[PDB]
């Protein structure tokens with residue numbers, strides 16, 4: 006089944022995780038009034054590389070999905086595994102964790118691949 | 132030997148596969164009439180990221196070469212291994228598979244890394 | 258400790274290697290006179306993808322740090338391990354190897370991932 | 384295990400309301416109309432032959448037609464469109480000469496009040512020496528006397544400069560699709576009953592909106608999108624009598640407008656290069672422009688609206704319709720464009736009714752002005768060139784712009800009058816089902832998954 | 837130091853009469869002519 010772009014928006018996070026390769030595909034899409042679209046499509050790739058840079062500096066690079074070595078703090082809306090992926094939408098979820106989104110981002114780019122990759126340089130010399 | 136940009140264009144696919152890192156290098160390259168090049172070099176990076184996005188959503192990301200778990204359908208010009216890499220150029224080859232290029236692309240972005248990476252999330256939790 | 262953008266510029270290379278994820282973060286950052294910033298921020302992403310392309314065609318892709326199979330030629334300022342990372346800054350170091358920077362780059366993009374990845378295609382078929 | 388770990392997801396259906404730079408789209412047949420770039424379609428992106436509309440199941444998104452930025456963007460686009468089209472056009476700077484005008488050739492009565500003026504004046508030729516004694520034909524609304532015979536002047540000479548619209552371009556409204564750039568999307572409300580504000584049960588996403596023709600008009604909404612089922616009534620604040628009431632029709636009201644005057648285009652030469660298009664003598668009878676509305680259709684449509692008005696102003700109340708209070712000509716009359724001319728019709732025959740709790744055509748007196756100043760703009764006056772032959776146009780009355788009085792006596796009766804002025808309202812009648820959102824595909828979520836060492 | 841790579845074994849069909857570089861160059865020289873005459877002196881009162 007292919008609901009299309011933003012298809013599983015009202016679906017659970019677990020269900021919408023199957024439609025990840027759909028919203029990612031149509032995310033980049035390939036005299037005045039003509040400069041209207043130029044300045045817009047320039048911001049389009051800047052918006053793309055911005056997320057890609059974050060996706061790269063973290064322990065991901067490879068898009069879609071990736072795991073990280075960061076313990077989930079209970080203060081970030083303590084829900085259960087079956088209460089998140091099977092009883093909540095991504096829109097509804099992003100509304101709660103929005104307060105801690107900037108906090109989590111810092112624990113991914115700094116605490117991980119700066120300490121993890123440097124750790125690997127010590128493990129690869131032997 | 133270094134034939135240069137588009138050097139092994141008339142060479143076999145097997146031979147031209149040695150010149151992959153050459154066409155990839157010169158692919159990005161680093162008042163009116165000055166806006167002529169601006170709108171052009173903007174399309175240059177959009178054309179680059181477009182292929183890079185496809186190269187990323189597939190089971191590749193790492194450029195140049197990568198393998199995939201997709202069986203070659205005989206309907207896509209049934210040729211042999213020694214009849215493709217040692218008796219056909221990339222220009223001549225792209226002319227035949229052009230009909231099925233859009234079809235193959237769908238089997239790489241959707242059928243693979245959406246089902247493969249999700250499969251890994253089940254294998255990495257244990 | 259977080260000295261900030263370009264923080265460990267006067268620090269040793271070994272010490273400044275801890276601040277790699279800091280200079281990388283603020284490297285992309287998200288009628289006339291308004292076109293002044295447009296043409297500038299276009300060059301900003303072209304400058305980014307240029308380094309990212311080199312970082313990709315080499316045996317890296319994954320940013321920050323990565324190793325390579327290239328022997329360090331003594332002609333490139335013969336210093337010792339403890340005399341580089343603990344007695345020299347990145348600014349001071351780049352000044353000496355500047356003569357051989359273009360030379361080293363060629364040994365990374367051509368000699369490696371063009372011969373290494375092709376080698377892997379032979380190792381992955383069996 | 385039992386302790387969760389964060390996992391980065393890329394490509395999650397997560398969006399938030401925002402504002403961005405929208406670009407255009409207008410088919411491929413519209414570009415074949417050519418005629419030296421009519422209106423806007425010059426470097427506009429061709430519309431996708433097979434557009435896609437994804438119905439977002441289970442999704443309820445709140446819309447706001449009164450706080451939608453697509454309108455403020457479209458409005459600034461049409462205005463800038465107007466200026467770019469008049470830049471390479473002929474400037475009528477030396478047309479402010481003293482005009483020795485007289486009545487048009489006809490036979491009385493004294494109630495005909497002239498209307499048409501036969502103005503004779505001096506004019507600069509190609510050479511910078513000898514002048515030119517040529518005559519033209521201006522409307523009374525275009526001229527104004529100043530104090531021997533009657534001497535006049537152009538009505539804009541004491542207000543601003545004047546430039547003549549090029550005869551190559553046309554003011555024919557063509558469908559324009561508004562699209563959002565990559566990373567953005569446009570949501571579309573698909574319920575049959577929606578007052579433009581509140582949560583929407585059936586929401587779908589699109590890349591480009593439907594073909595929205597930029598028809599500039601007042602009082603009567605022309606060539607718009609018809610409503611579903613019952614006619615719709617939308618207002619930012621119904622309790623506030625200062626807020627306009629946008630009406631949308633279900634069944635279109637057939638309207639016919641004509642210009643019963645075979646005009647002649649005199650092309651006097653104000654060289655070198657520039658050329659002014661005057662109005663020659665009139666071939667035939669001296670008749671005035673008019674608009675017809677089928678009495679049968681208008682009676683049912685108005686009666687269908689008042690039944691919806693009682694749903695907001697009490698079930699058993701009296702609704703009375705009255706004409707405009709007064710002011711500018713663009714506000715008191717039905718201003719619109721047909722065949723290049725700018726009509727100004729008397730709407731005292733459409734809003735002359737009184738509704739209690741329970742076969743021909745309506746002709747409307749229409750005036751014509753050549754020198755206009757739309758969008759409340761000062762500094763740029765456009766002289767619309769005369770059009771040869773009788774002009775006929777058939778349009779759709781698809782909505783009204785009504786205003787309510789403050790005289791109250793509120794719990795008794797209510798009076799509604801036609802309004803307009805702000806052209807931003809005209810776009811809201813088509814952009815009520817669209818809003819701009821940005822996609823943020825980066826979402827973090829916990830799961831019992833950990834990486835390697 | 838311009839580079840010219842000779843594509844060995846390659847046979848490509850050209851068409852000087854259906855080449856778009858001409859239509860692009862032509863529109864360039866024309867636009868070039870207009871931009872160079874915009875800040876120039878207009879001889880409007882020379883038609884005496």
Ligand SMILES: *[C@@H]1O[C@H](CO)[C@@H](O[C@@H]2O[C@H](CO)[C@@H](O[C@@H]3O[C@H](CO[C@H]4O[C@H](CO)[C@@H](O)[C@H](O)[C@@H]4O)[C@@H](O)[C@H](O[C@H]4O[C@H](CO)[C@@H](O)[C@H](O)[C@@H]4O[C@H]4O[C@H](CO)[C@@H](O)[C@H](O)[C@@H]4O)[C@@H]3O)[C@H](O)[C@H]2NC(C)=O)[C@H](O)[C@H]1NC(C)=O
Pocket residue numbers: 418552553554555556598605606719720721722723771775776777778779
């Ligand atoms: C709401 O929507 C309706 C429906 O779309 C719309 O009605 C349209 O009215 C306009 C008038 O304002 C019509 O436009 C003109 O139509 C006449 C008559 O067309 C006949 O011929 C065609 C074949 O070509 C038949 O298919 C058709 O049925 C008619 O029999 C045309 O003659 C007009 O052409 C002139 O104007 C064009 C644009 O302005 C120019 O491109 C064209 O070259 C013509 O300009 C010149 O023509 C002569 C040279 O040949 C020259 O001598 C003249 O001086 C002039 O400079 C024009 O197309 C339109 O057709 C109607 N729509 C439909 C579907 O028929 C309402 O106007 C609209 N309401 C509002 C408020 O916008």
Ligand SMILES: *[C@@H]1O[C@H](CO)[C@@H](O[C@@H]2O[C@H](CO)[C@@H](O[C@@H]3O[C@H](CO[C@H]4O[C@H](CO)[C@@H](O)[C@H](O)[C@@H]4O)[C@@H](O)[C@H](O[C@H]4O[C@H](CO)[C@@H](O)[C@H](O)[C@@H]4O)[C@@H]3O)[C@H](O)[C@H]2NC(C)=O)[C@H](O)[C@H]1NC(C)=O
Pocket residue numbers: 486487488501503518663664665
């Ligand atoms: C707005 O106002 C303008 C005035 O500025 C009017 O323009 C004038 O219109 C009148 C028509 O009533 C014109 O008068 C006519 O001029 C003709 C020109 O004569 C030509 O032919 C002779 C040879 O016969 C040549 O020698 C000469 O050089 C010309 O080439 C006359 O032929 C006409 O005569 C006819 O009418 C009279 C009426 O009494 C008859 O007795 C005659 O037998 C004959 O049938 C006539 O005199 C005048 O020339 C126009 N002037 C200008 C400057 O254009 C507009 O008509 C008016 N428009 C409106 C809508 O009111």
Ligand SMILES: *[C@@H]1O[C@H](CO)[C@@H](O[C@@H]2O[C@H](CO)[C@@H](O[C@@H]3O[C@H](CO)[C@@H](O)[C@H](O[C@H]4O[C@H](CO)[C@@H](O)[C@H](O)[C@@H]4O)[C@@H]3O)[C@H](O)[C@H]2NC(C)=O)[C@H](O)[C@H]1NC(C)=O
Pocket residue numbers: 490491492
């Ligand atoms: C040119 O214009 C003049 C205008 O001055 C016009 O002459 C006028 O004609 C009207 C009638 O057409 C006259 O009005 C009449 O007034 C008397 C009262 O004194 C009435 O009794 C008349 O009624 C009769 O005529 C009506 C005409 O429609 C009939 O409908 C009615 O049933 C009666 O039979 C009429 O109202 C007016 O007095 C004159 N004015 C002058 C100054 O003479 C002339 O006809 C016009 N010519 C052309 C060719 O257009």
Ligand SMILES: *[C@@H]1O[C@H](CO)[C@@H](O[C@@H]2O[C@H](CO)[C@@H](O[C@@H]3O[C@H](CO)[C@@H](O)[C@H](O)[C@@H]3O)[C@H](O)[C@H]2NC(C)=O)[C@H](O)[C@H]1NC(C)=O
Pocket residue numbers: 606607635778779
């Ligand atoms: C003025 O309003 C009338 C409505 O009475 C408009 O006529 C209608 O035009 C629409 C298209 O805009 C027609 O819809 C079409 O229906 C066919 C039926 O299969 C469908 O295949 C098409 O895809 C399209 O949806 C509609 O049929 C037609 N009404 C009638 C009775 O024929 C008219 O176009 C309006 N004029 C304007 C806006 O200028």
Ligand SMILES: *[C@@H]1O[C@H](CO)[C@@H](O[C@@H]2O[C@H](CO)[C@@H](O)[C@H](O)[C@H]2NC(C)=O)[C@H](O)[C@H]1NC(C)=O
Pocket residue numbers: 481482483503504505514
């Ligand atoms: C057009 O210009 C001429 C000038 O050539 C005007 O003719 C003069 O009019 C003035 C009064 O307006 C008289 O005093 C002169 O005797 C006239 N003749 C000349 C100056 O040679 C004519 O009136 C103008 N027509 C207009 C303004 O409609």
Ligand SMILES: *[C@@H]1O[C@H](CO)[C@@H](O[C@@H]2O[C@H](CO)[C@@H](O)[C@H](O)[C@H]2NC(C)=O)[C@H](O)[C@H]1NC(C)=O
Pocket residue numbers: 527538541542
């Ligand atoms: C330009 O001229 C017009 C027309 O004469 C002026 O409009 C008049 O404004 C006064 C305001 O006191 C009204 O009483 C008149 O009825 C208006 N005239 C018409 C024909 O509508 C306008 O004020 C002038 N602008 C100036 C002098 O700046």
Ligand SMILES: *[C@@H]1O[C@H](CO)[C@@H](O[C@@H]2O[C@H](CO)[C@@H](O)[C@H](O)[C@H]2NC(C)=O)[C@H](O)[C@H]1NC(C)=O
Pocket residue numbers: 637638639675676677678743744777
């Ligand atoms: C407005 O004009 C249209 C056409 O210009 C009229 O529709 C015509 O109606 C008559 C009946 O009286 C039919 O014989 C014609 O075939 C119709 N024409 C078309 C093209 O369908 C319409 O009746 C007019 N309405 C008003 C109020 O004047």
Ligand SMILES: *[C@@H]1O[C@H](CO)[C@@H](O[C@@H]2O[C@H](CO)[C@@H](O)[C@H](O)[C@H]2NC(C)=O)[C@H](O)[C@H]1NC(C)=O
Pocket residue numbers: 706707708709715731
């Ligand atoms: C609205 O309609 C009324 C008629 O009901 C108009 O009132 C007339 O105005 C004229 C002025 O031109 C007077 O000579 C009449 O005596 C008035 N009639 C009545 C019954 O009062 C009014 O002018 C119209 N207003 C608009 C803006 O159209």
Ligand SMILES: *[C@@H]1O[C@H](CO)[C@@H](O[C@@H]2O[C@H](CO)[C@@H](O)[C@H](O)[C@H]2NC(C)=O)[C@H](O)[C@H]1NC(C)=O
Pocket residue numbers: 729730731748
């Ligand atoms: C619009 O129409 C109305 C009514 O048809 C006009 O009002 C008339 O005004 C004149 C004076 O100008 C009076 O002699 C009439 O008695 C009025 N008619 C009625 C029915 O009262 C009005 O003048 C027209 N024009 C405008 C601009 O409103």
Ligand SMILES: *[C@@H]1O[C@H](CO)[C@@H](O[C@@H]2O[C@H](CO)[C@@H](O)[C@H](O)[C@H]2NC(C)=O)[C@H](O)[C@H]1NC(C)=O
Pocket residue numbers: 731732735
């Ligand atoms: C609105 O329509 C009514 C008719 O329903 C008009 O009433 C006219 O009133 C005058 C005197 O007040 C009579 O001489 C007319 O005979 C009436 N008309 C009819 C058709 O009988 C009223 O004038 C209209 N209002 C406007 C502003 O036009």
Ligand SMILES: *[C@@H]1O[C@H](CO)[C@@H](O[C@@H]2O[C@H](CO)[C@@H](O)[C@H](O)[C@H]2NC(C)=O)[C@H](O)[C@H]1NC(C)=O
Pocket residue numbers: 645666772773
């Ligand atoms: C308006 O008048 C013009 C002429 O002033 C008419 O044009 C004529 O049209 C007929 C056929 O329609 C041709 O045979 C003539 O040669 C035309 N004359 C000129 C001078 O071009 C035009 O037809 C009139 N308009 C209408 C609706 O009849």
Ligand SMILES: *[C@@H]1O[C@H](CO)[C@@H](O)[C@H](O)[C@H]1NC(C)=O
Pocket residue numbers: 078079080
């Ligand atoms: C979790 O959040 C709380 C705030 O409620 C904070 O005090 C605590 O330090 C956080 N945990 C970690 C490991 O930072």
Ligand SMILES: *[C@@H]1O[C@H](CO)[C@@H](O)[C@H](O)[C@H]1NC(C)=O
Pocket residue numbers: 100101102104
């Ligand atoms: C996020 O923080 C704001 C104030 O900072 C608070 O009002 C809101 O309730 C918080 N979100 C949740 C889901 O509690």
Ligand SMILES: *[C@@H]1O[C@H](CO)[C@@H](O)[C@H](O)[C@H]1NC(C)=O
Pocket residue numbers: 204205206
């Ligand atoms: C291979 O192509 C044929 C068309 O000739 C098609 O019927 C078949 O389904 C394709 N194979 C697969 C696995 O889809």
Ligand SMILES: *[C@@H]1O[C@H](CO)[C@@H](O)[C@H](O)[C@H]1NC(C)=O
Pocket residue numbers: 226227228230
């Ligand atoms: C590709 O398809 C077209 C028609 O769709 C056909 O004419 C052509 O021969 C096909 N290509 C090959 C190599 O057969």
Ligand SMILES: *[C@@H]1O[C@H](CO)[C@@H](O)[C@H](O)[C@H]1NC(C)=O
Pocket residue numbers: 330331332
């Ligand atoms: C190292 O540099 C010297 C130049 O001093 C050069 O001759 C030599 O070939 C280089 N080594 C390699 C392996 O290329």
